Amino acid sequence: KVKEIRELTTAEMLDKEKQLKEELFNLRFQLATGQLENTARIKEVRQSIARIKTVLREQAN
């Protein structure tokens, strides 16, 4: 789904990284209180952060 990520200006990249950090923090707190049938949504957030950082290292030469 990287094709979506290469379309975006460098500000919106950073905005999506901040949104992913917030969602990852809320998924931590919802693990700790015994919830979340969806436990495999966590890898998606980490790997989306990874893909955005690799793209922002690429377009920074």
If one asks whether residue 36 binds other proteins (CB under 8 A), the answer comes out as no
Rounded to an integer, what distance in angstroms lies between the CA atom of residue 29 and that of residue 33? 7
If one asks whether residue 6 binds other proteins (CB under 8 A), the answer comes out as no
Q: Which is nearer to RNA, 11 or 40 (CB)?
A: 40
Rounded to an integer, what distance in angstroms lies between the CA atom of residue 10 and that of residue 1? 18
- Give which of other proteins, RNA, none residue 6 binds (C-beta under 5 to 8 Å, depending on kind): none
Alpha helices in 1-61 (DSSP H): 10-32, 42-58
- Which member of 3, 7, 32, 58 binds other proteins (CB under 8 A)? 32
